[model samples]
Target: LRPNAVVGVRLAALADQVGAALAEGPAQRAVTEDRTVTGVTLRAQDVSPGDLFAALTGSTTHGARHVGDAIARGAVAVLTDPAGVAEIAGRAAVPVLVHPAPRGVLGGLAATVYGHPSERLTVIGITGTSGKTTTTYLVEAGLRAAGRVAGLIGTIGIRVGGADLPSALTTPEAPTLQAMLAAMVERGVDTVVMEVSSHALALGRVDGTRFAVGAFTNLSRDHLDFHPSMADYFEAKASLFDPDSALRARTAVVCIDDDAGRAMAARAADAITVSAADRPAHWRATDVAPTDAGGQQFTAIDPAGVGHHIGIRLPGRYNVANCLVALAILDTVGVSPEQAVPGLREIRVPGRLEQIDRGQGFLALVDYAHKPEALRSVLTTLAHPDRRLAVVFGAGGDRDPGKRAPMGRIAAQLADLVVVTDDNPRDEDPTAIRREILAGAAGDAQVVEIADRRDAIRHAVAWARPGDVVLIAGKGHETGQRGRVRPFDDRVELAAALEALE
Candidate 1:
C-alpha cells in the first residue's frame, strides 16, 4: 500500500476539492514546513511521530490538552477546532490549522494522506439497523464467488484480504478505514464490503472516500439515546445517501422491506430495488425454503429473467433477504448473478444466527441481535410448528431504554422459555435492565432472570430438553462487554459453562 510522506501538502490539496476554504498565512506556512504526516489517529494514545494532532474540542475531554505531548512524540502539525485553538495556541510549538469543526475533518484528512485507497478498490457501503453485518459478509462472499478477491468491514471486525482485525466500532474512524483499504489493495483485493454506521455517517468518519456502490438493507428503532428519535436516526443514516455528504457512491442498491428503505428507493434516481415479496425490482429472490439442516435454499432472479439457485448454509429469512441484496450489490459492481451465488452459499456471519452443536441434544444458536426488533425477527424466523424456541437475552445499560419493554414482550411472546439476563449494563443497574426486558414479555412462557451473565447461560443450558432450541441473543461473537465502558466477556463465561456441562 502507498503511504503518505508529507502531512500538510496532502491535506491542503484535498481540502480545496472538498469545499473547505483555506485560512491562509499561518496555516499554510505550518503545512509548508516539510512536516509529513504518515497517518492519522483520533486517540491521543495512538499518536506517534509524523502524526497530525487534531485537537477536537468536546465536553468529555479536550484534545488541546495533549498538544504538547503529541508534538513531543513527533507530530508535524495540529488540527484544532476554533475553541481548541484558543486553548492550545499560546503553547503549541507546531503549526495549527484551526477549522470551525476540526474533529469532523480529521477523519477526512486521514483518508486523504493515505493515498485515497478506496478509489483503487470497489467499496460497497451497507447501512441499516439490523442487517448491516450480515449483508456485508454476503457482499464479500458474493464477490469472492464471482472470482474477485474480497474484504469485509463491519460490526464484527475488519477482514482485509485474508486478515481479520478486531473492530472497536461498527464503522471505523476514517483514518483506520483508509489504512485498512490500503492494506486490502496491497493484498490484491478487488472489492471491500462494509457497514456504514449512523454514527460514522453523521460524524464525517467516511469523509473523502468514494464508494463504487452503496446499499441500504433496512432500518429500525435503535441508537435512540444518541439520536433521541426515529426521525433523527433515519436522518443520520440518510446522510450517507446525500450527494452533499463527503462520501457518496456512484451507484445505489436499496432494499424496500422497510418504510425508510422504500422511501430511499423512490427518491434515489440511480437505485435498484431488492426485495423478497415479489416486488418488481432489479434483483429478487423466490422459492425460498428452509432446510432440515437449518439453512436456506432460494432462487435468485435478476433483471433479465435469469435465475440461479443459491443454497445458503446460514439460518434465517432475514439472512435470505440479506443474501439477495448482497447478490444485487455484486451485480451492481460488475459481478454476474450466476458468479455471485456460489460464494454466497458458503457465507457465515459470525454472530448473526451462528448455530452451534450441543451434545446435550438441542439446537444452540448465538446471535448479535442486541436490539428488540432484531431479536424478535431472528427468534420468530427460527421458530416453527414442531421445535420449541427458547431465548436468553439482556439489554445494554446505557442505550435505548424505549426498546427494553418491547423487547421483553417479544421474547415472552416468541420463546417457550425466556431467560432474561444482564447485557453490558455499563454503569447502570444490571437488575434494572433485566427488569425492563421482563416487562415486555407477553405470553405464557416461563421467565427467569439471572443477574450474572455466566449464571444465566448455565441456567439456560441446564434446562434445555431434546428438540428445544436455546437462542442466546444480544452479544453474538463478542467476547467482551463493557461494564463502565470497560471490557467484559460473555463468550468466555458461556464457553466455561458448556465445558463444565460436557
Candidate 2:
C-alpha cells in the first residue's frame, strides 16, 4: 500500500494516456479485463494487490530485480523500461507494461491513473534557491485570505485542505505527487501551492503536473553537489517555464532581483517580472520600510498601475522579493493585488528567519542558511550599528565543499562573533568540515569551533548579552542532526538553553 495512493482508475485508460505499450502477456489480458488500477507505487515495499508497480532502473541495480518482492506484496501490474521487460517478462504471473522511458511517463501515467486531479485545481508552482518555501507559504496565505480552499506541498511538509502531513522531499516522485494532487481534489481543495525544486525538475518528478502559474525567486551558489555547474542549475529551474517541458507552467512570474532571475525571465520570455530594487518591472515594490514588528511595509504597484499597501510579517530585503514574487503569482492566477497583499501579513515561513522567543530580553532567531549567499543575506539583513549580532552556523557535509569557507567568511564579516559548528555531517568527518569553514573565517572575526551542535547553541546563547542578537543558523526548522549518531533539533536545544538561562 503506497502512502496516500490514488485508486479506481482503469489501467486501459492510463495506457492510452501515457502511450505505454502492453506486451503480449497477463498484462495485456489485465488491460482487456478493464481492471481498475487502485494505486501506483515506485517502491516494492509499498505495492498493494491492485497497485501498478513502477519498477524503474536504479543507479546500481535494475528495479525489475524487485518484481518478485512487489508481486509478493500484491502488485497486480508492473511498469518498466525496455531492459526491465527482459528481466520481468516470463518470471511473474502479472501484466507487464513497457515504455521507452519509464521515468518520462511516470507522472503522466500516475495522473491518468488518478483521473487527472491537477486539472480540477488551480496549481501554483514555485522554484528558487532560497525562498521557494517562503513564497509558497505566502501564496497559500493569499489563497486562504481570498476564501479559496488551499493545499500545500514543500520543504517543511504537505497540507491537504488544511490538515498538515510530514514530507520527506520538497517535491515527491510523480506517482506520489499525482496521488497527493488527486487526494487534494477529493478533499475539496481548489488551489494548490507547491515548491518545485531543481532536483525535482531535473529528475522529472513533476512531469505530469499542470501548473496554472509558476514563479522564480533569486538563485545562488547552492546544490552544486547535485548539479554540475551553476548554468545547469539555472537550466533545471528553467525547465519549469519551458513550454516543451512536461513540468512547464501555463504562465510564469519571476523575481528579477539577480542575474539568474533575468536569465530565467529570458527563458520564460513571457514572464511577468517583479522587482523591489527599482529596476523597472511589471510589478514593482517601492517605499519599503521596516516595521516595528521586525517585518517590512511596502507598496506594490501592479501592471495596471494599481497600488497595493503590502505588509509582510517576514523580515529581510530578500523576503520583500519573496513577497513581490508571491504577489505576481497571485495576479497570474486572477487574484487582485488588493485582495492578496493583505494576506501576506498572516504568512509565517518556518525555519526562515523564525524567532524563538522565550521572553528573552534580546532577539534570538533560527534560519536555514547553509550556503554562502544565504548566510550573507540573512546576517546582512540582521546587521545593525547598535545591536551586536552573534551567529552559530555551519555547512552541510557531502555537499558543495567550496561554499563551506565562503559561509565562514560571511559569518565573520557580518557578525561580531562566529560560531562554526557541524551541520549534517553525513558520512563525512565533522572536524574536517569544521576545518574547511574555519579556513575561511581566519582573520575575519572572533571564531569559535564547537563540533557538538547542542553545545554550540548553548555556548552562543550564553555568550549573548541583553542587547545582543543570537542566530542559530544552518538547521532552522529541521528536527534531526544527521551524523554518526541520532540527531536533535536546534530549535529544541535553543529553547532548553534559554529556559536554563532564566
Candidate 3:
C-alpha cells in the first residue's frame, strides 16, 4: 500500500469511465494482487500510508498545491477533478485518477473502498430550511426506543450508540460519512440518522451514501448568499430526491406545512406526505395545542393508513409536524407508528429551543435559529402580547449574507427588544457584520448592538425584568467560533455568560 502500487477500481470507477481520466495520476507502476484502498484522506496535512489523497479545489486555492506534501506523507494515489492533474502530473510518484467532477463520487467511491457499508445499515437523511436538526434527533430517539442501535450525524454533532464525537459540519465530508457508516457496520449498528444540508448536496459531500429514507421539513428564503435565489436553493436540496441523483433514495417523508414542502410531496410519487397545518395530505394532525412546558400535544391521523395519539416534549406547533415527519420516516423503515409515538413522549434535543434557568425571575431560551424562517418562526412561537420579548441574534460571516438583514428585521418586529450580537464573525470584521443586521432593525422596539458576544449576553440579562423573555438565538448547541483555520465553540462561553448573570 505504498505510493508505487495499483489499487482496485472503486466508487467513481464508472465515473472515471464516463470521461477519459488522466493517465499519469496514481502510482500503478508496481504490480500487486492487493489493490484495495482502506481509507480516503483529503487534506495534505493528514495523509497516511495507503491513503487516496483528494486534491480538491477550494475558494482560496487549488488543492493540487498540497500533492507534494501529501505524497511525501505516504499517499498511495491521488483523486482529482480535471483541474488538478496538470499541477501534479510529473512531480508525483503515485498514480492520479482525474475526472470531470470527482466530488460527486467521493461518497460512493469511499463506500466502494469500505465494502459498501451503507448497504448494510439503514441511513435516514433529513433535509429542510428548518426543523432538520430537531427532526433528526426525534428520528434517532424513535429508532433507539424501538430497540435498534442508532448513530446520529448533524448540526448537534455525531453520536453512535450514545457515544459522542466532535463535529462542526452539519453533514461531514463524503469520506468521513462513509467511514462512520463502515464503523457502525463493524459495531453491529444498523440505523443512522443524518442531517443533510443544502451546502453538502451542492458540494457533493453526500455523493456516495445510500439513503434508505429522505425526509423534508420546509423551505424558505435562506442561504441566498450561497444559492442566489429560492429556486437555486430548492434545486440544491432537491438533488437528494432526484430520480437519478447520487442519493437515489428508496423512500421519502415530506412535510407540507409550506409551499416548498407541499410541492416536494406532490412531486415525489412514491413518498408519504404529512402536515400539521391545513393541507390535504396523507398524514395530518388534529387537536393540536401548545403547552406551558414548552412542548406540544397533537393527535396524528395517518390517511386511514396508520393512526396514533402523539405527545412530543419538544416545543412549538412546528414541532408537531417535525414529530409526524419523524414517525413517517420510522414507518418508511418499518418501525410501527405505535412503537414510535411513545418514544416521542419524553424526547428532547439540546439547544433546539432549549431553556435556560435565569435566577432573576425571567424566562430565557437558547436556540440555533440563524436563517430568516427559522428565526421568525421560533421568535413568533415565543411571542406573547403581555410579556416583553427580547432577542439576541446575529449571522455568521463568510456564509449566506442575504438572511442577515431579514433575520434582524424579523427579530425586531416580533420581540420588544433586539440585541444584535456576533454569532461567528469567522474571518470577517465583527462590527461590519453587525451593521448589516442593524439595517433591518426598523421598529419602535429597542435595538442594541453589542459586538462582543459575552458582553452582549450579559447586557441583555442585566436588562431583563420579571416576566421578560430573553431569547438567545443562533449558535445553539454549537461550541466553537471560526477564525481563519480555527473555530471556537460559543457554548461554554455563552453558558458561562448566562450562568454568571444568574
The numbered model that scores best in lDDT is 2
Q: Best-fitting candidate, measured by TM-score?
A: 2
Q: Arrange candidates by TM-score, highest first: which order?
A: 2, 1, 3
The superposed Cα distance between candidate 3 and the true structure at residue 417, in angstroms, equals 1.7
Expressed as tens digits, the lDDT of each residue in 76-164 for candidate 3 is 77778767987775767766667667776666776666667778899999999989999998998899889889989998778878688
Every candidate's lDDT: 0.75, 0.84, 0.77
Error of 3 at 42 (Å): 2.4
- Lowest lDDT 10-residue stretch of candidate 2: 1-10
Mind sharing the TM-score for model 3?
0.87
Clashes of 1: 7
Ranked by lDDT, the better of candidates 2 and 3 is 2
The clash numbers for all candidates, in the given order, read 7, 2, 16
Model 2 clash tally, residue pairs: 2
